[PDB]
Design a protein around this ligand. Structure first.
Ligand SMILES: Cc1cc2nc3c(=O)[nH]c(=O)nc-3n(C[C@H](O)[C@H](O)[C@H](O)COP(=O)(O)OP(=O)(O)OC[C@H]3O[C@@H](n4cnc5c(N)ncnc54)[C@H](O)[C@@H]3O)c2cc1C
Lengths: 662, 132, 15
């Protein structure tokens, strides 16, 4: 809706001021309501202007010209708003043609550890603000966990693969700046069982609904019943699902017991009736003989003998009446018995096949969080749900590496440079690194500040790859320990021809066991060339890194042969298997909210370190060691856009500190 | 507010989580309860099968034809004497006395109790019925 | 996390 949509696209509420804005505009937010709406319009309009053409720099002068009265009345307010948006990277981020060339004199010096998207994004901003910036990268390439495989015409992504909706995504801006061949991924995803045949539509929908009901139940368990500690240990999502599943199995058995208990009660009531009818039949039989003996006394007869015949006649019809009423009651209970024998409750909660298909949905959850469900925090695993972007998910058909390569343009990047030690003091920092090709070649970089974008996996290493001097404080290291760093791998299969449905972008494979539910569980058809990409998720991810490529490719072919037939599936021309946990510069795939952790730990990862004073009694020094990366952004963890946004955040915090605010 | 058809009471959760093997214990106790009830059904089913064998044929050999009598107001001596014996056997069950005599309504039997009270010593006859 | 899911997006427990 014009300006309101610009707010949405920048992850801002159009109709109110954020916490970050309140800090920079305390006069406005504590002031009258009318002035707030002017601020909000100026903000929303400036964002719209930037978003309509993000290929060129939006200057303050250009912004003020395109505003109308009474909003362009106050010029300092427009200047303050524009400067805020530029500093925090809401406008003039990414790759754009600069109107005013960069000032030759550079102010301050920053070392950025790592040239992934978080590092690259921060670097561009800091250079754009007029700082001297150098990136130290251990790999022989930029991009980090954005890692694209390229051989001939084959282009597949072993790391980041998918833009998860453009609605609110800063990668929407980057896609207008860089040629990413964005291609919508169609949602249709047929599951194929272990044998190779499709799951029937009736069963597929039944299990998926039950999976979501099970998930909903774990959330109910967490928030309503407060089932979050068990044996002084935090409850995982895996535990909770196990407990929920067990309670459904309990109910199935309780339901059977109550049904069969109703049958015995009916059968005992019938037994009591039949005994009464057998005793009555015997009383009728005896009474019939007495009537027959009395009746065979031929007339003429006295009145007592006549009475005897008629007395016994009356008594016999009275007993024959009772037996007829009891035979009606026999008929009522016999049909009431037959209805309960006809309509029993369920035999099982879930069969072997249902439970297998249910494990696929669990594996899909283990892919999403890059970890076994036994590691996920029950309460907080889905804490970032509210900030999900709207729209279709998209493939990057150019290969996602096109983004970091473009972001690296015009930046001082030292490749093959492994940081070994980070020293930070009140007077400055020095970063000590080596050449990865020959470890004896040592380098020393001196700077005013360090931005650490090392992956959480690297920060977790024991014994450490990177030493901090002085050591990081307990509040930082405990957060590092608490946070999860998952694993997820990809098998790329390049063929000479398409043997699969070209209109279906993805299809599942259901594993035989729970143990192997993540193993090659999901296939992707995303690229122009004939490429299939299979995922190894869950517990399989870690285990499958110790198995060779030939065996892994064999297991993929085995599965694909089962689905499309042996003659249809040729041997692939090129193959690649990722091993992200064994990668020493990643040590895993991406972060997750582990049991015992929360969203607050992401905020702790983001908090910069301030060293002690050099001389005792010297004034409180400024912060020196800053942190960015997917593991540092609470609302967008484990993503490219999260990394991107975290870099923009730290460039602003660093610029505010060393260039001064506004 | 759980999901529909999920059963998640506070008590159930504690029973299945209280120790490491409490889940499988609870489910085994109900499996044994289920087998216990099933054999109890088989027992009574086979008991009732034997009782139906003894009721085979119904009461069709022992049922008598329906007597269809026209009601009459005039008391014969025979009918009076049947009544005094019916009163001796059945007491005040007026419906029973009517069925025995065959051609007197329930109201006419009640009139008999008052009209012939002194003549058939009906107070003495009811005293003999109450003594048994 | 959950936001990563492209195929068969889980709905249970989301607002
Ligand atoms: C298999 C897989 C699939 C994924 N799919 C998606 C997806 O579909 N969508 C999505 O949004 N996100 C996805 N991601 C996540 C995304 O790749 C990351 O969140 C993001 O790229 C991380 O950026 P970063 O800059 O925080 O860290 P990184 O990209 O890892 O950058 C950090 C850099 O530090 C370097 N480094 C490490 N140690 C040292 C050292 N001692 N000295 C110097 N440099 C060092 C590394 O080499 C690296 O270049 C996926 C990740 C994986 C593993």
């Amino acid at each position: 809706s014009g300006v309101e949509g610009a707010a949405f696209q920048s992850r801002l509420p159009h109709d109110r001021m954020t916490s970050q804005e309140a800090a920079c505009f305390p006069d406005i937010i504590s002031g009258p309501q009318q002035t707030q709406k002017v601020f909000l319009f100026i903000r929303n309009r400036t964002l719209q202007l930037w978003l309509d053409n993000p290929k060129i720099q939006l200057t303050f002068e250009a912004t003020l010209q395109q505003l109308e009265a009474p909003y362009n009345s106050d010029t300092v307010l427009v200047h303050r708003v524009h400067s805020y948006l530029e500093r925090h990277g809401l406008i003039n981020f990414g790759i754009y043609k600069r109107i005013k060339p960069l000032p030759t004199k550079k102010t301050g010096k920053v070392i950025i550890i790592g040239s992934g998207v978080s590092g690259l994004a921060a670097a561009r901003q800091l250079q754009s603000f007029g700082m001297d910036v150098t990136l130290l990268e251990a790999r022989d390439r930029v991009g980090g966990r954005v890692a694209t495989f390229r051989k001939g015409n084959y282009v597949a992504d072993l790391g980041a693969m998918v833009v998860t909706g453009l609605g609110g995504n800063p990668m929407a801006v980057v896609s207008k700046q860089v040629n990413m061949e964005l291609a919508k991924i169609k949602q249709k995803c047929p599951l194929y069982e272990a044998n190779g045949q499709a799951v029937p539509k009736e069963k597929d929908e039944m299990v998926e609904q039950e999976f979501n009901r099970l998930l909903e139940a774990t959330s109910y368990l967490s928030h309503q019943l407060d089932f979050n500690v068990l044996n002084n240990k935090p409850v995982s999502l895996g535990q909770a699902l196990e407990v929920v599943i067990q309670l459904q199995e309990k109910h199935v058995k309780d339901e059977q017991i109550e049904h069969w208990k109703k049958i015995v009660k009916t059968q005992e009531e019938l037994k009591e009736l039949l005994n009464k009818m057998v005793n009555l039949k015997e009383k009728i039989k005896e009474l019939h003989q007495q009537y027959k003996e009395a009746s065979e006394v031929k007339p003429p007869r006295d009145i007592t003998a006549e009475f005897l015949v008629k007395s016994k006649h009356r008594d016999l019809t009275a007993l024959c009446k009772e037996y007829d009423e009891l035979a009606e009651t026999q008929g009522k209970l016999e049909e009431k018995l037959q209805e309960l024998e006809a309509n029993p409750p369920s035999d099982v909660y879930l069969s072997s096949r249902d439970r297998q298909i249910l494990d696929w949905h669990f594996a899909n959850l283990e892919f999403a969080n890059a970890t076994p469900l036994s590691t996920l925090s029950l309460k907080h695993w889905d804490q970032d749900d509210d900030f999900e972007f709207t729209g279709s998910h998209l493939t990057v058909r150019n290969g996602y590496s096109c983004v970091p390569v473009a972001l690296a343009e015009g930046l001082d990047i030292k490749l093959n440079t492994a940081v070994r030690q980070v020293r930070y003091t009140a007077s400055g920092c020095e970063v000590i690194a080596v050449n990865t090709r020959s470890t004896s070649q040592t380098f020393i970089y001196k700077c005013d500040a360090v931005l650490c974008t090392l992956p959480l996996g690297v920060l977790k290493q024991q014994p450490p790859a990177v030493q901090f001097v002085p050591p990081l404080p307990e509040w930082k290291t405990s957060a590092v320990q608490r946070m999860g760093f998952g694993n997820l791998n990809k098998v790329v299969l390049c063929f000479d021809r398409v043997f699969w449905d070209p209109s279906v972008n993805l299809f599942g494979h259901v594993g035989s066991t729970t143990a192997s539910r993540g193993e090659l569980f999901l296939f992707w058809n995303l690229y122009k060339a004939p490429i299939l990409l299979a995922l190894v998720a869950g517990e399989a991810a870690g285990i499958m890194e110790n198995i060779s490529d030939d065996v892994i490719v064999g297991r993929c072919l085995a599965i694909l042969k089962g689905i499309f037939g042996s003659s249809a599936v040729p041997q692939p021309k090129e193959t690649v298997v990722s091993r992200w946990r064994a990668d020493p510069w990643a040590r895993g795939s991406y972060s997750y909210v582990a049991a015992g952790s929360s969203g607050n730990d992401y905020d702790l990862m983001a908090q910069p370190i301030t060293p002690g004073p050099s001389i005792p009694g010297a004034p409180q020094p400024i912060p020196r060691l800053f942190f960015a990366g997917e593991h540092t952004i609470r609302n967008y963890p484990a993503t490219v856009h999260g990394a991107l946004l975290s870099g923009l955040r730290e460039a602003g915090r660093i610029a505010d500190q060393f260039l001064g605010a506004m | 507010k759980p999901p529909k058809g999920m059963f998640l009471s506070q008590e159930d959760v504690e029973a299945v989580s209280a120790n490491a093997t409490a889940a499988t214990t609870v489910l085994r106790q109900l499996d044994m309860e289920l087998v216990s009830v099933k054999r109890q059904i088989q027992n009574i089913k086979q008991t009732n099968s034997a009782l139906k064998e003894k009721l085979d044929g119904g009461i069709e050999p022992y049922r008598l034809p329906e007597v269809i009598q026209k009601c009459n107001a005039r008391w014969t001596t025979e009918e009076q004497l049947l009544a005094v014996q019916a009163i001796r056997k059945y007491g005040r069950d007026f419906q029973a006395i009517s069925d025995v005599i065959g051609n007197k309504s329930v109201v006419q039997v009640k009139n008999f109790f008052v009209n012939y009270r002194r003549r058939f010593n009906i107070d003495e006859v009811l005293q003999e019925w109450e003594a048994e | 996390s959950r936001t990563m899911q492209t195929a068969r997006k889980s709905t249970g427990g989301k607002a």
